[PDB]
Amino acid sequence: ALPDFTSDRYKDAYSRINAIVIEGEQEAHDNYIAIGTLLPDHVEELKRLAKMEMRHKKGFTACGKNLGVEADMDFAREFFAPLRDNFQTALGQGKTPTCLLIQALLIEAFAISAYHTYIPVSDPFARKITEGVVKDEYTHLNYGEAWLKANLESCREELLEANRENLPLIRRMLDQVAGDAAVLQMDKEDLIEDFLIAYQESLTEIGFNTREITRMAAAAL
Ligand SMILES: CCCCCCCCC[C@H]1C[C@@H]1C(=O)O
Ligand SMILES: [Fe+3]
Ligand SMILES: [Fe+3]
């Protein structure tokens, strides 16, 4: 069941998946620095999170180089454009809960699911890099959960709107990546399950009840 990492079929799918991961890590760095303009007293902690994202980007860049694959960066920029646009719109409006739901919850849960699914089918070099990134994703999810949990009473409606608008974009991103992910021997059903479990667990931690969460996860449709 392990893929042939040297085949043209594998390298072609990897060129797009690796580019999406590299672009995602760069946008994650940018997003935590941007949140620092909304939360000036959190700047040092956000800089630390942004620095971890740069370490992840460098590591995944090395994964692509190791397989002799040239990352399709243009494809990756277009892939993130819808979610990036919604983050920039919220940032410009000073909407911190929306920025945090997009980056610290949706994007981190998407990263956790993708990385957990990739690890058992990854090449030995990439496996170590991916394993060394997963602990940091939980740190980032925890940061977002902690702020939203402390501020839930003033941003309940905003979070429901942010979820309604952005959860379907994650669903569309999963649909667009499924073909290439299957070449990498990753099952779309495992990616969906792991993402929903991480996202539902974060919403539970924040303080949403079962009914609220069910209504929220249903927005994906
Ligand atoms: C098969 C799915 C692979 C594509 C999904 C990878 C998304 C990368 C998400 C990174 C930006 C998130 C982070 O570092 O917090
Ligand atoms: Fe990361
Ligand atoms: Fe992250």
Side-chain angles (χ1 to χ4, degrees), residues 1-69 71-127 129-134 136 138-170 173-220:
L2 267 189
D4 174 0
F5 309 115
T6 73
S7 75
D8 291 329
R9 170 179 170 270
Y10 188 89
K11 291 199 281 180
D12 168 66
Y14 206 85
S15 69
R16 293 178 296 276
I17 296 299
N18 186 234
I20 285 164
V21 168
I22 293 160
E23 182 64 27
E25 300 293 349
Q26 181 61 52
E27 293 190 17
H29 165 274
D30 294 351
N31 287 351
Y32 287 121
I33 294 301
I35 290 164
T37 67
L38 300 178
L39 301 170
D41 56 316
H42 281 232
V43 161
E44 294 308 327
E45 179 165 38
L46 290 157
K47 278 167 63 195
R48 261 187 78 258
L49 302 190
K51 279 186 180 73
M52 293 175 204
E53 298 297 16
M54 278 307 308
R55 185 186 66 83
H56 303 170
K57 187 193 180 189
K58 285 185 191 164
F60 294 126
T61 297
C63 290
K65 297 289 187 167
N66 179 60
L67 296 187
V69 178
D72 189 347
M73 299 309 299
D74 286 338
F75 183 86
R77 268 173 223 118
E78 194 50 31
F79 179 84
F80 275 103
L83 208 44
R84 185 170 72 241
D85 288 350
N86 287 355
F87 185 99
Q88 298 311 119
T89 301
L91 172 67
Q93 291 171 1
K95 287 178 176 175
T96 321
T98 301
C99 290
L100 282 173
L101 184 129
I102 293 165
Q103 176 63 51
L105 305 189
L106 291 176
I107 292 167
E108 298 297 339
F110 184 58
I112 282 152
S113 174
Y115 302 155
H116 279 333
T117 308
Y118 176 56
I119 287 157
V121 291
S122 61
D123 74 77
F125 176 94
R127 191 169 304 213
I129 289 187
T130 313
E131 285 171 331
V133 153
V134 280
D136 288 350
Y138 283 100
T139 295
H140 298 174
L141 264 183
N142 291 352
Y143 172 78
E145 289 165 358
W147 192 91
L148 289 174
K149 180 173 187 192
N151 292 275
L152 183 62
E153 297 313 307
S154 66
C155 71
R156 265 189 194 269
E157 284 312 307
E158 184 177 330
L159 288 184
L160 297 177
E161 184 60 19
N163 177 72
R164 269 195 300 274
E165 299 290 280
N166 297 283
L167 184 61
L169 298 188
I170 296 291
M173 285 158 74
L174 280 161
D175 291 342
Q176 294 169 351
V177 94
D180 287 331
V183 169
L184 266 60
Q185 281 287 83
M186 295 166 71
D187 187 346
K188 192 186 179 179
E189 270 179 40
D190 290 340
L191 288 167
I192 294 166
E193 182 193 294
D194 276 14
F195 165 80
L196 290 172
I197 289 295
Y199 188 50
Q200 292 170 341
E201 282 172 350
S202 293
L203 299 175
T204 293
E205 181 52 34
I206 290 160
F208 289 104
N209 60 40
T210 304
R211 278 199 168 263
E212 291 174 306
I213 296 169
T214 294
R215 191 177 191 104
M216 286 176 83

